[PDB]
Amino acid sequence: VSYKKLIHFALEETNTHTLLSPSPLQEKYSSLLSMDDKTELQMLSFEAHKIRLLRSLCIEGSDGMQVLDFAAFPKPEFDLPIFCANFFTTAKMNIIVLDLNPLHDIMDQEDYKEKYYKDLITLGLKYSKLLPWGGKLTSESLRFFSPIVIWTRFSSSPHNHSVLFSAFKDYYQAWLGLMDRSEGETDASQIACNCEAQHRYLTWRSEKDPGHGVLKRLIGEDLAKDVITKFLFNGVNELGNKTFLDYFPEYRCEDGKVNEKRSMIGKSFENRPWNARGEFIGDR
Numbered sequence: 227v228s229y230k231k232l233i234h235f236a237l238e239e240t241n242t243h244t245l246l247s248p249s250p251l252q253e254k255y256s257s258l259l260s261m262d263d264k265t266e267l268q269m270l271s272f273e274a275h276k277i278r279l280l281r282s283l284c285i286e287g288s289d290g291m292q293v294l295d296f297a298a299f300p301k302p303e304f305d306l307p308i309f310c311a312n313f314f315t316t317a318k319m320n321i322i323v324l325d326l327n328p329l330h331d332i333m334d335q336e337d338y339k340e341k342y343y344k345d346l347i348t349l350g351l352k353y354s355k356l357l358p359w360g361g362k363l364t365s366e367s368l369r370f371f372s373p374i375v376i377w378t379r380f381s382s383s384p385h386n387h388s389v390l391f392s393a394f395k396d397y398y399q400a401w402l403g404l405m406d407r408s409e410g411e412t413d414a415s416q417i418a419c420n421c422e423a424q425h426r427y428l429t430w431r432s433e434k435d436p437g438h439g440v441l442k443r444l445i446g447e448d449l450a451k452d453v454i455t456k457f458l459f460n461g462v463n464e465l466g467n468k469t470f471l472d473y474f475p476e477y478r479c480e481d482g483k484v485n486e487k488r489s490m491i492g493k494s495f496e497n498r499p500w501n502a503r504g505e506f507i508g509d510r
């Protein structure tokens with residue numbers, strides 16, 4: 227399949243809810259060839275009144291590799307979930323995360339979870355049946371997933387990719403409907419709290435997202451770290467001063483470096499840790 231189709235869908239839909247404007251990042255991140263010149267990375271970026279950054283990375287290889295990383299980051303005044311689509315596809319295999327990632331914790335407290343997901347449980351139920359739970363995964367990743375997350379692995383077929391496309395569109399339209407209803411925060415302390423929550427999220431992903439190894443192989447370590455911190459998770463430098471180890475001290479090694487492990491806990495949650503009503507039940 228061509229994930230460019232989905233980027234086109236999303237930009238068109240967004241422009242019926244607001245007006246996108248070009249991000250300044252478009253002058254520094256647009257097109258990049260891999261070191262062996264066989265793979266092209268295509269990058270797009272935009273902003274809007276409530277959206278700090280809407281950005282896509284699309285990778286098409288002559289080998290069958292197709293990658294989409296598409297995200298919408300809100301301005302800290304709008305405590306919206308972060309829209310997240312991370313599709314890693316090869317000739318035969320698909321490894322997929324699609325979610326409205328919660329800005330604030332939905333595990334211990336209830337207010338934010340009810341505010342944003344109460345009316346989306348049926349949407350998550352629709353696709354959890356069609357795109358089955360992907361199995362055990364990095365336990366720290368669940369800190370960032372919503373009760374409607376689609377985490378799935380599947381073999382390539384016309385039917386499975388058709389379902390994936392329908393899910394992306396349904397989930398992105400749901401997120402745009404949340405954006406419609408997002409009113410700006412006026413309390414300065416709350417804006418700071420929303421900003422730290424976003425910075426913590428960007429800091430986690432810029433350090434530990436699974437795609438970083440593939441990027442490093444394609445364009446080398448130096449440019450990959452640049453694309454990761456200044457484009458994909460732009461804001462890790464500007465929205466806060468805390469380091470990855472400030473937020474996640476469990477990863478501090480005996481020498482003060484960040485532990486090479488992706489997961490300090492280990493991979494867990496062999497079954498979906500939310501029940502059919504979206505209540506967290508997580509075992510292992």
Ligand SMILES: C=CC1=C(C)/C(=C/c2[nH]c(/C=C3N=C(/C=C4\NC(=O)C(C)=C4C=C)C(C)=C\3CCC(=O)O)c(CCC(=O)O)c2C)NC1=O
Binds near residue numbers: 363435436493
């Ligand atoms: C907080 C948010 C968040 C997201 C979105 C995410 C996705 C994610 N990607 C995975 C695999 C994978 N993902 C990729 C590749 C890519 N993947 C991409 O998203 C891109 C852009 C590429 C390529 C450039 C590969 C190659 C694997 C399998 C190998 C591995 O697990 O390293 C896994 C399973 C491995 C694990 O359990 O760690 C998850 C949960 N995890 C998170 O914590």
Ligand SMILES: [Cl-]
């Ligand atoms: Cl694997």
Ligand SMILES: [Mg+2]
Binds near residue numbers: 262263
């Ligand atoms: Mg070259």
